[PDB]
Each structure stands twice: as C-alpha cells, then as structure tokens.
C-alpha cells in the first residue's frame, strides 16, 4: 500500500544496495533465499503466491562485473533475474558515455522494468535512487533515468541518495567534471537529494566505530542504516508518523533548495556499547554534532533551515520535544530567521535492527537527522573550483566531446551550479 521503488545505479549504487537489501531482509525476517518462515514488507517487497518475497528494486549498471557479483553471491535467489540489468561496456567515468551513447538502450530497458514494477504497486510513495555523483554510470545513466522518470511518472517523489566527491580525498580525476554535469542534471529532476561524502563517513567510522581501516562495506552499512531509519515510518507504526510526501513539505522551503545533509546517531561499536545511557537528549545532540554529519560540511558555517528527525526505538514525544527545545536553545546551532519552527520530529517504535557481522551495536534508541541547511553551499563551492581548475585548460574535455557533448553543456552546467550558489546565499541571508 505504501510501496517504494528502489533504483541502484552504478558500482556505488549497487554496493550500497547490497547492504540496504541485507538490512531490509534482516529487519523483516526475509531469508536470502527470498521467503520468510503484518504486511510491513509491502513497502520494499512484493510477495508471490508461492510465499517468496521479491524486492521492488532495480540494479542498473553498464558494467557486468558488479551485477554478476550479486548474481553469484548470497542474494542470488532473492532478486529478480531480469531486474538485475547489466551493460556490456562500462561508462569509463564518462558522463557523455553514460548519458548519450551507451546509456540509451540500457535506460530504455530500465524504464521497461520500472514500469513493470510500478504496475504492481497499489500505492507509490516514490522512488529511492541510489547512485554515485562522480562516475559515468552513476552520473550520466542516473541523470537520464531521472529525466525519463520525471517525464513519464511525473509527480512521484524521487529521493536521490547521492554520493558526492570528497573535498580533498578522491579516487577519480574527471570526478569534478561528471559531478558538475550530474548536479546540473538533478537540480531540476529529483525532489530531495541527500548528499553523502566518503571522507565524512570514513571519519565517522574512524572516530566512533574505531575502525582504523574503513571500507566500502562499512560505508554502505551506515548508509543502509540511514535509509532504513528514513523509511521506518512507512513500514512500522509509531507516534508522529512521517511520510515520504511529508519530507518535502516539511523540509523543502523552495524547489531549487532540496539538497540535504544526513547524520545518524548513535554510531557505537559492540565493545564500547552499554557503557553510557544513550538518552534521547544525548543522541539528539550527537546527531546535531558537526562531526557526526555524513558530509564534509561544517554546519557552523551556515544556518539550518529545516531539520527532520527520525527517532527509532523507545522514544517518547516529550523526550523529543525537550531535546529539540535544548537544541533550539543551543547557541552553536543557528537557524534562519524566516523559519521559527524549523523542526519536523517523527518517532517510530521499531528499534534499528543490527546486521550480524557489522560493527554497529544494538541500541534501543536511534536518530536520523536529515537537514536542509545553507551550509551545503560549501561543498558546491569546492566542486565549483575543482571543476574550473581543469576546465580552464579544457583537460579531459575531448573525452566527453567524443561521445556527443559540447563545450556549451559544460558551460551551462557550471553556470547552473553558480546560480545554485547564489540561491543558497540568497536563502541563507535574511
């Protein structure tokens, strides 16, 4: 009844989807074979007459290796074989390759399977698009798919949980290029874009979970926990229920401004667990801590516009009200003058399930704080100069030109990002 269609595009998308679907299977009791030994799974799973539950997900990639890893691994009997869509040639970190030449047929087939999935949903809260801003498969093909979805489905709420390049550390060279291109693409298509940075999540794992060698599996586990906390109100009942549609209405002040920072709390390992109270006020403070945010973006530089809190577990509305009153009275946290409330609290009675073999400990309370704040303009300022430094010499421009782009596309994308900077300044200032 509250079905949500999940899209996982690119290597990062599919790898975070592995953790996400492992988490959902553990949460709902679904074995990896597909079936479990009410009707809370309908948000993420559609059940057949045989009793087996199949996810309403679509794994899209122009590279076959990542999808074949899922086809061979534990969740080979869970997913739909045709839902796993694989390309032949990788986008090779080329937004042009993934958006103009290779991505056409793959995205057409993706729309076909997405249509088959959406025809099986009574209600449809929206789409959860998980891609990697900074890679040809993620950026180009994800942008094209989002454009097609906006064209055909229309007003369905698309939530893009994008992974943006980190400020200093990175793994690619043309990452600012295709990041700027994808940002220009998704400024006008996705309804709420959640920013994520590998550097920030690495720092989180290092200082909180005490992992000196963090990896993508740990990062994806944390992201999956965040998404599960976000969607918990759709699957499990609790006081102050929040909806996917309510996210935008309580969180998006203006259509252009829909990029959001995310912070989960508490992030504690099994060893140091049960050593502190972990009360509601403490976990709210931890969520609002600048370090706990999953983007390398100091919130102290900007001003919070809206903050949606998703509380999980033994949480009472008076506790959340007192905690938010303390947060408002805190002087480090600064809100915009035009949003006196700026807060959207939603509680749920389902504590976060812990993945066996993971580093997170079993906590009876959890907070996912997703905030629209003007501080996020800082990361756009960083990518805006990381891009322009190469674009001055037109480095790697011929690579993008070869697959059907023009200098005008880069110019338009960069101008759009500058306009986004200006808009962020305008909303932040009185």
């Amino acid at each position: 009844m509250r079905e949500v269609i999940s899209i996982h595009i690119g290597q990062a998308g599919i790898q975070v989807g592995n953790a996400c679907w492992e988490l959902y299977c553990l949460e709902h009791g679904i074995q990896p074979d597909g079936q479990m030994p009410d009707d809370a799974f309908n948000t993420f799973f559609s059940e057949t007459g045989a009793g087996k539950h199949v996810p309403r997900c679509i794994f899209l990639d122009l590279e076959p290796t990542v999808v074949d890893e899922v086809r061979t691994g534990t969740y080979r009997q869970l997913f739909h074989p045709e839902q796993l869509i694989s390309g032949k040639e990788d986008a090779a970190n080329n937004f042009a390759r993934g958006h103009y030449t290779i991505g056409k047929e793959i995205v057409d087939l993706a729309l076909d399977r997405i249509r088959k999935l959406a025809d099986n949903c009574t209600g449809l809260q929206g789409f959860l698009v998980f891609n990697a801003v900074g890679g040809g498969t993620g950026s180009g093909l994800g942008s094209l798919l989002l454009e097609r979805l906006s064209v055909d489905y229309g007003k369905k709420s698309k939530l893009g949980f994008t992974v943006y390049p980190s400020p200093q550390v990175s793994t690619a060279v043309v990452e600012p290029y295709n990041s700027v291109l994808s940002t220009h693409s998704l400024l006008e298509h996705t309804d709420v874009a959640v920013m994520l940075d590998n550097e920030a999540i690495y720092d989180i794992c290092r200082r909180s979970l005490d992992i000196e060698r963090p990896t993508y599996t740990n990062l994806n586990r944390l992201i999956a926990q965040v998404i599960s906390s976000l969607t918990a109100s759709l699957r499990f009942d609790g006081a102050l229920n929040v909806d996917i549609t309510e996210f935008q209405t309580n969180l998006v002040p203006y259509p252009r401004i829909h990029f959001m920072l995310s912070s989960y709390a508490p992030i504690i390992s099994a060893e140091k667990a049960y050593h502190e109270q972990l009360s509601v006020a403490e976990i709210t403070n931890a969520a609002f801590e600048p370090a706990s945010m999953m983007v390398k973006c100091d919130p102290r530089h900007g001003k919070y516009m809206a903050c949606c809190l998703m509380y999980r577990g033994d949480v009472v509305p008076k506790d959340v009200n007192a905690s938010v009153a303390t947060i408002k009275t805190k002087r480090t946290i600064q809100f915009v003058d035009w949003c006196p409330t700026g807060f959207k609290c939603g509680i749920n009675y389902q504590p976060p399930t812990v993945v066996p073999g993971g580093d997170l400990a079993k906590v009876q309370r959890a907070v996912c704080m997703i905030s629209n704040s003007t501080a996020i303009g800082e990361i756009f300022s960083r990518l805006d100069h990381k891009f322009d430094l190469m674009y001055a010499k037109r480095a790697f421009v011929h690579w993008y030109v070869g697959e059907g782009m023009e200098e005008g596309e880069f110019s338009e994308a960069r101008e759009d990002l500058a306009a986004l900077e200006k808009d962020f300044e305008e909303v932040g200032a009185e």
Partner: peptide, 22 residues
C-alpha cells in the same frame, strides 16, 4: 571561481559574435 564565471560569459559572447557574423 569569478574568473571561470567571466570566462563562460566571454564564451557566450564569442558564440553570439559568431552567430552575428553568420
């Protein structure tokens, strides 16, 4: 950043100039 903004403006002006020449 201001440099590359003004560079894109210059590129647009050059494209307009070429179109006018055509």
């Amino acid at each position: 950043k201001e440099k590359m903004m003004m560079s894109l403006e210059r590129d647009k002006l050059a494209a307009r100039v070429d179109a006018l020449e055509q």
